[PDB]
Design a protein around this ligand. Sequence first.
Ligand code: GDP
Ligand code: GDP
Lengths: 429, 429
Amino acid sequence: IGSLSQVSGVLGCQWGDEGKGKLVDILAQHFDIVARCQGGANAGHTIYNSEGKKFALHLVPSGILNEDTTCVIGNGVVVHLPGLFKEIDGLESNGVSCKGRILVSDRAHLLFDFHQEVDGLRESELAKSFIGTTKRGIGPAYSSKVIRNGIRVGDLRHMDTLPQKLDLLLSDAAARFQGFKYTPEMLREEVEAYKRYADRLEPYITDTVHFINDSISQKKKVLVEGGQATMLDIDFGTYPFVTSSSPSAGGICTGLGIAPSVVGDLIGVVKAYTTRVGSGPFPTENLGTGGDLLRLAGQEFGTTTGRPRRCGWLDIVALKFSCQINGFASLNLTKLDVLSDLNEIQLGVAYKRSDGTPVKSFPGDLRLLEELHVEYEVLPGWKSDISSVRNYSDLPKAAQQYVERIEELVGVPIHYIGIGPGRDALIYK
Amino acid sequence: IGSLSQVSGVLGCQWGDEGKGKLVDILAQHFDIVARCQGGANAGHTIYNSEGKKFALHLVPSGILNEDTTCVIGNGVVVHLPGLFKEIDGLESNGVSCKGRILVSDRAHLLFDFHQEVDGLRESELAKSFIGTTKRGIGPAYSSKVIRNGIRVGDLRHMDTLPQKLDLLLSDAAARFQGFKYTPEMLREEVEAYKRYADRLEPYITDTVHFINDSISQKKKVLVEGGQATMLDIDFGTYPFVTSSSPSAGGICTGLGIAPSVVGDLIGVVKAYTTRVGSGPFPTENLGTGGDLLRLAGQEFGTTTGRPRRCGWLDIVALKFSCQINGFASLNLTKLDVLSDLNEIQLGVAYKRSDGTPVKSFPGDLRLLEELHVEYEVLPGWKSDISSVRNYSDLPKAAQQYVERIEELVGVPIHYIGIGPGRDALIYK
Ligand SMILES: Nc1nc2c(ncn2[C@@H]2O[C@H](COP(=O)(O)OP(=O)(O)O)[C@@H](O)[C@H]2O)c(=O)[nH]1
Ligand SMILES: Nc1nc2c(ncn2[C@@H]2O[C@H](COP(=O)(O)OP(=O)(O)O)[C@@H](O)[C@H]2O)c(=O)[nH]1
C-alpha cells in the first residue's frame, strides 16, 4: 500500500459500480492529494468511516474523509454548482470540514440547470435504446464543451459577460427543443443565482493544472480517482451505451493536465462478478437464480430508485480488454464475499461467433456483442462466511484459487481483495 | 534518432503549424507504424519528398510517404469519407500506393456532409466574435459523439440500420437549425452514397485498438502523430479559441487505446517563434514590423486562403506550460532559419498583470490573457544564411545560444532543429 507510486490512480474495469470509493478512502490515508478527472455528479461513491456512517459522495473526491488530504476537482469534470454546494453543505453538517480542502478547477465546465432539462427532453424521443441516465445532463454538458460555447468555472469571475454566454447556451437549447420553456425572465433568474454561486465558489476556484504539476514536482503524493468504469468509456466502451466522459487512464491526463509519463501505477477495481445499470450489451448477464442472487447478496439496486441492476459473471474477455486499455499495475477484486453462498462459480473465459469462429478481443460492434456467446469455466465455490477474514492465507482454498485464477487469465496481479462494505474489510495481497 | 522509444509520439506546442508533418515524415524511416489519434481533416501537414514534390496530407498520417510503413487512423479521429478517398485518390496518382497501408479504425466517428453545413450555420448566426474555421464541421462531429447519437465507421457494416441512424442525426440537425434544408430525398441521397463508401472502405476498416496493442507486444515501432498543438486543446488551450479534440499527450491514449505507461518519448515541435491562424489570446503577438518580417521569412499565409497569419516571439510561458502538460522528452525547434535576418531576437519570458502581480503559469481565463503584458528578453541574432548547415557546431554562435537558451528556460533538451522546409533540412543534436 505504501509502495504505490507518487502519482497513483484508481479506475473501474466493468460497467460502473465496482467499488472504487471504498478503495480511494482506504488509500487516501497515505496520499497528500486526491483528484477526480472526468465525469460529473452522475457518480455515487459510497463509503463508511471508522464508526459506520454512510457517506455517498458525488462530486467531492472520496478522499474527503481524510482531514489531512486536499481534494481536487479537475478540468475534465463537469460541475453542477447547485448540487456541489448541496453536497458540501450536508458534508460539513455531518462532520467533515470542507473549508480550503476542495479545489475546483477554473478550466472545468459548468453543468447548468438547463443542461438537465435538455437531456431529458431527448429521452422522450429515444426508441427502445434509451439511456439509463435519469435527466442528469452529462451528455449536453460535454456537448457544449466540444461545441466551444459552454461556460467554464473561471468564467464566473466576469459577471459582466456571463449573462451574454448564458443567452447563447439557452438560445441553442430553445432553438433545438420546442418543449424547452425559455423566457427572458428565466435568463435573469440563473444570472442572479449563479452570481451568488460565483461569490461562494470563489475561494474554491484554483488553477488545477498548475497546482497538480507544482505539487508533483514538490514530491506530493497524488491519487487520481476514476470517475466510472472503462466499459462505459465514450471510446472504448459499448457505444452508444456509455457515458460522455473518459473513465479510461487517458482521462487522467486530459482531465488533470498530467503527462502520460507522470502517471504512475493504476489499480483496476474489478468486482468479483459483473453488473450494468442501464440497457445495452452484457455478454455474461444472468437472468435467473444466480442473477437474482448476486443482486441480493451484493445489494445491486439503485440507491435513489431501487431499480434492480443487471448481474452476471466476471467477464474475463472484457476484463483483459480494460487491462490493456489502461495498463493496470494491480487489481482490486471487490465483492468477493458476495460469492460466499455460491455452490459453483462461473467465469466468462471466451467469446465465439454464431458460426463458431472465436472472437479475438472485446469487439466494438454492438451487434456482434449481442450475437456471440460466452464460454464459461466453472470453479468450485467455498460456502463459508468470510467477511471477517483479514489475512490472505486465512481465506478458504476455493476462494484463493478463484483470485489466483483471475490473475492467471488476466496477467495482472491482485493486491487488494474486498470482502465487505466496511472500511476495514480489505485483504491485502 | 534510432534511440527513440518503442512508442514515440510527436505533438505541437504552440497554436498549430509548428512543422510536425516534416518531422514525422523524417522519423518514419525507423518506425513500423505511424498513427493519427485525434482531430479531423482540419489538418494540413506539408511535406517534401527526396525530389521536392509538395505533398499536403490531411487525414492520412504523414508517414504515408515511407513505403514500408503502415498508417493507422485511430478511434479518436473524425473521418469524413468523401475527403479521405479524394485524398487517397490524389495520393496514389502521385505515386504512393495506399493499398493495405491505411488502417481505418472501426471505432472512429464519421464526419458527415451535414456536419459541415451545420457548423457553418452557427458562425453566420453568431454576432461579433467568430471562430475563424473553414467550416469543416469538427465541432459538430464530436458533438454527436458526446451525445452518443453519432455514427461510427463500424456501423457501415450494417447497412440495414444505417439509414435509421442517419434520420436521427439529420433530424437533430433540422430541428436545431431552420436554415438546414432537410428533405426525405437528401436522406436517401447520403444512404446510397455512403453505401458505396462502405463497400470501398471495407478493406481499410480494422480494429485499431487491437492492432496497435498487439503490434506493440510484438515489438513493432509506433510513432503517434499529433493532430495540432496543445494551445488548441479543448481543455488546456485558450478556450473557446481551440479545437474540439485533445492535441495533448492524453489524446494519444484516448484516441488509440494506449495505456499511459505504454507511451514512450514525446517530441514537442516548437517553432523558433509563434503563430496563430484564427483570432483569440496571443500574448506575444507583434503588430509591428517585427511581426511583418517574421511572417515573410516564414511564409505564414493560409495555403487555401492566402490569409496573413498572426506572428510573434517564441512564448516561453506558453511553452513551459505545454511542456509540463505533455511531459516532453525532447523538442524540435522548427523554422530557426526564419530568424536569420533578425538583428535581435526576443523571447516572451514572463507574464505580469496590469497591477504588476506576476501571472504564475499560463492562465485559463481568456480575459486575464488579454489584459496581462509580457516581459521580453533580447538575444543577439546571427545575420547569415543557415539553410545549408548540416552539423550543429557549424551553426553561428548566436544561433546555438538561442537554441541553448530555450533549453535553459524550459528544461527540455532540443534534439531536432529545423532550418528549412526540406526533408533533409534538419540538424540533429
Ligand atoms: N458486500 C460488499 N460490499 C462491498 C465490497 N466492497 C465494496 N462494497 C460496497 O459496495 C458498494 C459499491 O460502491 P459504489 O460507491 O457503488 O461504487 P463506485 O462506483 O466505485 O462509487 C458500496 O456500498 C461499498 O461499500 C465488498 O467486498 N463486499
Ligand atoms: N522555413 C522553414 N519552413 C519550415 C520548416 N519546417 C517546416 N516548414 C514549413 O512550414 C510547414 C509547417 O506546418 P505544416 O506542415 O503546415 O503543418 P503541421 O503538421 O502543423 O506542422 C511545413 O510543412 C513546411 O513547408 C523550417 O525549419 N523552416
